[PDB]
Enzyme design. Structure first.
Site, mmCIF file in Angstrom:
data_model
loop_
_atom_site.group_PDB
_atom_site.id
_atom_site.type_symbol
_atom_site.label_atom_id
_atom_site.label_comp_id
_atom_site.label_asym_id
_atom_site.label_seq_id
_atom_site.Cartn_x
_atom_site.Cartn_y
_atom_site.Cartn_z
ATOM 1 C CG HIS A 13 -26.145 59.690 46.521
ATOM 2 N ND1 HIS A 13 -27.268 59.614 47.321
ATOM 3 C CD2 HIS A 13 -26.300 58.748 45.560
ATOM 4 C CE1 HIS A 13 -28.070 58.670 46.859
ATOM 5 N NE2 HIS A 13 -27.497 58.117 45.801
ATOM 6 C CG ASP B 62 -48.749 57.999 91.449
ATOM 7 O OD1 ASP B 62 -49.229 57.127 90.691
ATOM 8 O OD2 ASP B 62 -48.809 57.829 92.692
ATOM 9 C CG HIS C 15 -46.134 55.417 92.823
ATOM 10 N ND1 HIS C 15 -45.881 56.772 92.817
ATOM 11 C CD2 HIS C 15 -45.008 54.825 92.359
ATOM 12 C CE1 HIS C 15 -44.645 56.987 92.397
ATOM 13 N NE2 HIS C 15 -44.092 55.820 92.118
ATOM 14 C CG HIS D 122 -40.967 53.150 94.612
ATOM 15 N ND1 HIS D 122 -40.295 52.570 93.552
ATOM 16 C CD2 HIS D 122 -41.650 54.197 94.092
ATOM 17 C CE1 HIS D 122 -40.590 53.216 92.438
ATOM 18 N NE2 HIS D 122 -41.411 54.206 92.739
ATOM 19 C CG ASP E 122 -42.066 53.144 89.245
ATOM 20 O OD1 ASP E 122 -40.987 53.742 89.424
ATOM 21 O OD2 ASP E 122 -43.029 53.448 89.970
HETATM 22 C C1 LIG Z 1 -40.570 60.785 94.859
HETATM 23 C C2 LIG Z 1 -41.731 61.485 95.172
HETATM 24 C C3 LIG Z 1 -42.826 61.551 94.316
HETATM 25 C C4 LIG Z 1 -42.743 60.906 93.091
HETATM 26 N N1 LIG Z 1 -43.512 60.729 91.995
HETATM 27 C C5 LIG Z 1 -42.865 59.966 91.036
HETATM 28 C C6 LIG Z 1 -41.602 59.610 91.490
HETATM 29 C C7 LIG Z 1 -41.507 60.188 92.779
HETATM 30 C C8 LIG Z 1 -40.440 60.129 93.652
HETATM 31 S S1 FES Z 2 -26.468 62.334 49.414
HETATM 32 FE FE1 FES Z 2 -28.027 61.052 48.562
HETATM 33 S S2 FES Z 2 -29.307 60.392 50.276
HETATM 34 FE FE2 FES Z 2 -27.803 61.777 51.099
HETATM 35 FE FE LIG Z 3 -42.097 55.356 91.288
#
Ligand SMILES: c1ccc2[nH]ccc2c1
Ligand code: FES
Ligand SMILES: [Fe+3]
Ligand SMILES: c1ccc2[nH]ccc2c1
Ligand SMILES: c1ccc2[nH]ccc2c1
Ligand code: FES
Ligand code: FES
Ligand SMILES: [Fe+3]
Ligand SMILES: [Fe+3]
Lengths: 193, 447, 447, 193, 193, 447
Positions: free
Chosen positions: F104, F205, F208, F213, F362
């Site tokens: 509107h 982490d 992992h 990786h 991942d």
């Molecule tokens: C490098 C080292 C530690 C990490 N934890 C998550 C990604 C990552 C990359």
């Molecule tokens: S002007 Fe009516 S919903 Fe935005």
């Molecule tokens: Fe990772």
């Protein structure tokens, strides 16, 4: 071309097929194959199943669609059935399927289904040994629509062998599809790829 | 919804509320009271015959690894790492002495034990209690002639007892035939139906065959084809129906050994089964030998179905109230010739697999009946299963269980749903037994 | 959420909580208190004129079969088999004397009665109570000049009474024009909006036209086009707004007979309506004759909307809180020449159908306003509908209902949402009446 | 070819179209048609709507997309309007749609939409009676993407008639699409197929 | 052809590309380009990544896929980075990606993925200035399927430059894709378009 | 579920119930107790440097407009019209003095104020209270060296205090480096994981990396590559882990300034960071200068993560329990040469963007661990985070916070989840403080 010892993800089967098409290129054959497949898909899309059988499918046909079990890429000991046949049909078995499609008590075909097929990536090469036979590779997207809001889309690559036939009427003698989705999310696979 | 008091299944299993096929709260409740309580199909010996062989299977919505141990036994474990819960195995089958987690590399043996942790000494020192960190194990794993079932509940009755009166019917084909093999891998397809819809169809529904499958009957020219379009019904004595305490049941169609197979296999099968039958007459008697070569449409409660003779073997794996993942295997007799084994397996898939033309006939029936269970005006409506009520018997001199001596009826639906009420309204196996102490009386009432 | 006490709509309908467009628990509650309680559009006589003709329609989330009986009446039934609950009819329209279930073959007549059961004598004998197994019938089915509505509640007021004060406005076009026909089949499209978003837009929103539809106004060159981009507002006396006890309401834009039609139809329509108007002056009076050829944007509570003169007829079929299935038909005057009927129908679809360029302008508005109702910081926020409040009147000598004598305002939103509170907070039709005993006083308060 | 008394699922209309393409094959015409359609789709994909109108669409055009009501395959009595026109446009009506697309107050076009079209299964045949006219059949997958996470994919078969025009500029004189999904799940059908 | 002052939704870049293909048409070149792209897609679909690098990708390659930020069609003041590179790879960077795909400890590649590509709408035009270079435009639908029930479909238009190479082995020297979906709903874009 | 009493995270953060990654009721509860309570990343000064510049950002599931005011401050508002709730802004970035609603036409300024209403005088007269109709404003907006965060709760602690002990670690790179810029636009991808899965992975982490990786390490030849396939672990003193009161934490890998960058950038980066480090030795001391050029993997509670030196900056935007929208930006040092800025940004996307080969490694880990939280047999199972427990310290003379003096451990998970329990079980910021009054004692317990 390919060396599967180096290209570690490639199967021996796949590497053989690339060899077949990369070698001799016959532009006219590619175009003929394209027309043939487009005509086949048109017949299927309008649900002219008897015409498809009569005009496109050879008496010696093997129409095969497999589903392979998911196995580890590093597997090498487990040796039991690797795939299963969603389709593995001879001509008579295809005919049974066509009769089922055309029966007026096939309740699932009312209201009429709608099919649209998209054929791409056509490649063709003559068989080295049997001059009646042409290898044709193509990819298909198949769209099914039924009952207002049911829509199922199928995707696959097809490895075909077609015979010259008589009168210029080429006929399918083998279709092989390794279906890429292990668990189907299309209600069923009751479509002709 | 109070499951202790809600009448979802009427007395004698005569009707069920349509909401049972659509209610998501009930589905969650079934995970506890049906799937975590009862026996569920896992695999067959023929699929994991050697030490180290394994497959993945679902048990309800859980995924498990099923593994052949070095001592020849089979153990099953949740497919979930004990560290941070990643799925351990991403394939469907294989051979291995252990499974290593792709997240942080924890390694578990085929026996579920935590065997290795990367850099355990430098990181955890001696602080890691590996003995309490084995994969979560399926409490119970038992075999019925090579067919392996699992149960998460240590209070469950043994599998053989759980099969109750149905076992007598399965034994000719499962035991006296010399044994069956399951031919894998299975077809796998998702349908938009509740798991109970196909379960009930296979447990007790011969009424639908002539009409639902009119086109398949007509086109395939199989032995049951006289029924196409209800052109004709069979002979009053063409078969029977049965059901049992724990919910399993089946239909019996006398002599139909070629089952749903198209005419191309009918002669070979009818010859094979008839020859075996002749030998079984002397070993197990004429009645049981005939049962061997008779078509049984069965559901092993809750979600395992099969068609003997046709060789169709199904698992209806629940995903949600209107979603099920259908697994289709073929069953073959071990002593059939190899080439016949191959053709029968393809025919099973041709008729009942992912592109099965018979299975396609049933799709809309199962899906719409399930989905209608969600619709406001149908939730509280009653699905009817009264066909044949007050003509069923039990403790018959020849045929055990609660039995309807007619080919077509709803005896098996009534027994399936009676067992279902009892479970949904019970907190444990003792309560189910208390609720089931007059099970056959409830089913035969007015006779 | 306690619907007895929760203020979802403030006093006088001045505001609503944004959650009403996104809350799934409320959607479930509306199934009971809105869709199972009120009158819902089914079809038109012109779509099922002959005995045996039928169509399927939705009523809330339920699907029904609407069938012309041999005696000329229309009855409607749930599209669900009484046996195991399969959907009976899979098509949208047809002609038949009965409907047979594809599962087990039960056959029902066009009158809902269970007429045949396969092999009834051999299977059920005389035990089947067919008289109590007819399809579940829609309690109430009534016509407003050929337009057929259904209601699941036997306590509902008659349709004519339910239309209340809005009926007076519709009568010139629906009755005195000689009658309308609905041109099918409808377009059908799913949008990701709550059903209330388009319902409120059509019931009372002229404010959006100049801005939302700037591009369509500019491109189509229709009669309302001076408003493109709010380049100009109309004359204080260019129209009015009205609302009624049971929730129905509409806007009136004086003389706009060609409505949203592009210039290609404007001359023919303006000639046609003006000629009919001249004849109606003598029959129903100058004011009502002018109303006949005036553009009415109306919602018949809860989910049926229309634009007279433009000839747009919509059903906003609920799927879930953020999903609606939109059905679009064209309405034409029966005595218009056939070729004009055809062109008008195509123009209705061109502007407001599945590829309607005007309807496209509204998509994002409806979808995002609905979806924002789910967002945490907006759930408890207030949607405003105060434009024009304390200038509405009722019991006017010429124009009935609660009326705002201005073209643009929010009178009709206030009446729609007042009726909505009253229903959501009531268990039955008697409670709605008790909650509505001072409806017009609440709406006109500060004047 | 087809006999619709035997091929029970095939409509008379569909059988006529197969006849048209299976007869005389003109490889050069197929390739010309392929180029024409690829160029048209390119113009549409970049939202060059005025250029499309000027270069590809004839003054006598009928651009028609229908939605057919679902009826029983065995129906034969109910005879009321079978379809409805999602599009049934003449040139001026297309021009109105193009102006709507280009108006800076078309709020729905900001941010800019993204279109990608895939044209396949091209077949072409000259009209038997009017030598200015070429029949072209093709299938389209159309992908629309807007507003971050809105994605709508359309699928259809197109039955076209194109005129030779002047200067080698072929122009569309008729496009007919029978849309395969009865209930759209793409928000709308406001795309040019 | 196009005038972007009138065709208000068309970008200057897009209008330049239409000009390139509409001018001189060389049917033989179109067919050669079609074969080339079909062969490339076949190698990719079978996961012959080393072969793809060796047979299809030039040492000077720039392989670029961008994601553009959503901005108002009427914007004209905000001048900060308009896009980001999902891919912007030289040959060595592609090689790193290929080695990652082939490493046996790429756990995500077991079980083996399944790819199916559909290439359509091929157009080709020689570069005006460098006779070793061919411009090729094509659209791709790419279907990925893994782990039973994971299915991701990608859609895009590709603007390529290929060099003649030696021995008839044409090699990609530039691929540019402006990805049409701003927020991906395919888990990632780790596929070669 | 009673969040006051339910133990979702055990004492000392040693374990968490797996259901926290799958439970939708809990997700809804986190919207209130996590996302509406804590500080959330919005944008960087470098993205909206000039008056009128704006971007859209998510805050939990809400969308906000973040706008540079004329006075140089930044204000943020819900992206929702105050009239009928349509989304106001449909683009991601731009420059404007106001925003007009497409429904509107209401116009709001960059300062949130309702500035214009179409035809206000003719329609609303003087009745419209525009001063109370400004966009709903984000209560708190604060900057950490150019990085802009928002909080809907006026009771939140200031951003600098909220960063607690983590701030000391970020300061060398965020402040003493001369400042960072964020290079936009971000990559945006939806993953089927809970937002906590990537948050925990980045917060703590390092375990992992070598295994998850392995392939990326091997292929990219980056500096951390010796760990590929756990071929080797680093030196006990190769780094540390830390966590803080309000949940933020990080890993530190000494000297790893080129981070995940492939060998093509390693020499240039190692030269750049080493030269800056040499200058910082004199300004902030050897330890903090080394921290500057050390790789920090951090999560700023709840859902903002980053890898300094690598230059990866992530927002894990929650959609539902198993859906997250991942936004990926690159961070660069302002005084790096332009060409190096460009190459680093592309490398960030190459490794961690939508087609990031490291990020791809991942995917399955995060998705399956999240989805398994929905599975019946895993809901009540315990995710383990005990690595290193009872060797953490606090109040160390050199390194602040709760600190594990080892490169690899689960210290940071324990602090993240401790803060999470405290929030989920608390109704406000005062209750969180009461629940956190012995936070570091709980984390170091057995040492
Ligand atoms: C490098 C080292 C530690 C990490 N934890 C998550 C990604 C990552 C990359
Ligand atoms: S002007 Fe009516 S919903 Fe935005
Ligand atoms: Fe990772
Ligand atoms: C043959 C006979 C009875 C049956 N019930 C379900 C399938 C089936 C097949
Ligand atoms: C014309 C006039 C007023 C209106 N309200 C909704 C649509 C519409 C069209
Ligand atoms: S989740 Fe399996 S090792 Fe960590
Ligand atoms: S469900 Fe309709 S006859 Fe059985
Ligand atoms: Fe069946
Ligand atoms: Fe509108």
């Amino acid at each position: 071309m390919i060396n599967i010892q180096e290209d570690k993800l490639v199967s021996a089967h796949d590497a053989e097929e690339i060899l077949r098409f990369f070698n001799c290129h016959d532009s006219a054959l590619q175009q003929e194959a394209t027309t043939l497949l487009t005509q086949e898909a048109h017949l299927l899309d309008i649900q002219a199943y008897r015409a498809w059988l009569e005009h496109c499918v050879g008496s010696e046909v093997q129409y095969q669609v497999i589903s392979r079990e998911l196995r580890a890429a590093s597997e090498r000991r487990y040796k039991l059935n690797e795939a299963m046949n969603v389709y593995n049909e001879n001509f008579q078995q295809l005919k049974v399927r066509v009769e089922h499609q055309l029966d007026p008590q096939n309740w699932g075909n009312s209201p009429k289904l709608r099919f649209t097929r998209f054929i791409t990536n056509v490649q063709a090469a003559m068989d080295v040994n049997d001059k009646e036979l042409l290898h044709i590779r193509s990819n298909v997207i198949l769209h099914r629509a039924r009952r207002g809001n049911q829509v199922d889309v199928f995707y696959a690559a097809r490895e075909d062998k077609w015979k010259r036939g008589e009168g210029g009427v080429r006929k399918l003698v083998q279709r092989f599809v390794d279906y890429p989705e292990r668990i189907l999310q299309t209600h069923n696979l009751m479509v002709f790829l | 919804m109070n499951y202790n008091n809600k009448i979802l299944v009427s007395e004698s299993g005569l009707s069920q509320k349509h909401l049972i096929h659509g209610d998501e709260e009930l589905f969650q409740h079934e995970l506890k009271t049906i799937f975590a309580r009862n026996w569920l199909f896992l695999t067959h010996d023929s699929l994991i015959p050697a030490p180290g062989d394994y497959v993945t299977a679902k048990m309800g919505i859980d995924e498990v690894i099923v593994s052949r141990q070095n001592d020849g036994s089979i153990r099953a474990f949740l497919n979930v790492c004990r560290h941070r819960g990643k799925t351990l195995v991403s394939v469907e089958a294989g051979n291995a002495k252990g499974f290593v987690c792709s997240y942080h590399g924890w390694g578990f043996g085929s026996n579920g034990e935590l065997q290795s942790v990367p850099f355990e000494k430098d990181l955890y020192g001696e602080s890691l209690n590996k003995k309490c960190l084995g994969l979560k194990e399926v409490a119970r794993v038992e075999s019925f002639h090579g067919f392996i079932y699992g149960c998460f509940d240590q209070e469950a009755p043994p599998l053989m007892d759980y099969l109750g009166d149905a076992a007598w019917y399965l034994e000719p084909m499962f035991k006296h035939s010399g044994g069956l093999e399951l031919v894998g891998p299975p077809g796998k397809v998702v349908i938009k139906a509740n798991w109970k819809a196909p379960a009930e169809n296979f447990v007790g529904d011969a009424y639908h065959v002539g009409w639902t499958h009119a086109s398949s009957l007509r086109s395939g020219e199989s032995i049951f084809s006289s029924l196409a379009g209800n052109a004709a019904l069979p002979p009053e004595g063409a078969g029977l129906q049965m059901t049992s305490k724990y919910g399993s049941g089946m239909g019996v169609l006398w002599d139909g050994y070629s089952g749903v197979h198209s005419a191309d296999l009918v002669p070979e099968l009818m010859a094979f089964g008839g020859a075996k039958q002749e030998r079984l007459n002397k070993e197990i008697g004429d009645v049981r030998a005939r049962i061997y070569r008779s078509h049984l449409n069965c559901t092993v409660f809750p979600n395992n179905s099969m068609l003997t003779c046709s060789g169709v073997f199904k698992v209806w794996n629940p995903i949600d109230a209107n979603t099920t993942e259908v697994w289709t295997y073929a069953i073959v007799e071990k002593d059939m010739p190899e080439d016949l084994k191959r053709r029968l397996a393809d025919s099973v898939q041709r008729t009942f697999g992912p592109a099965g033309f018979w299975e396609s006939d049933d799709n809309d029936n199962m899906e719409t009946a399930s989905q209608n269970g969600k619709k406001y005006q149908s939730r509280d409506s009653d699905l009817l299963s009264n066909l044949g009520f007050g003509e069923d018997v039990y403790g018959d001199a020849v045929y055990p269980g609660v039995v309807g001596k007619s080919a077509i009826g709803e005896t098996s639906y009534r027994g399936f749903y009676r067992a279902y009420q009892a479970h949904v309204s019970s907190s444990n196996w003792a309560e189910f037994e208390h609720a089931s102490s007059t099970w056959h009386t409830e089913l035969t009432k007015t006779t």
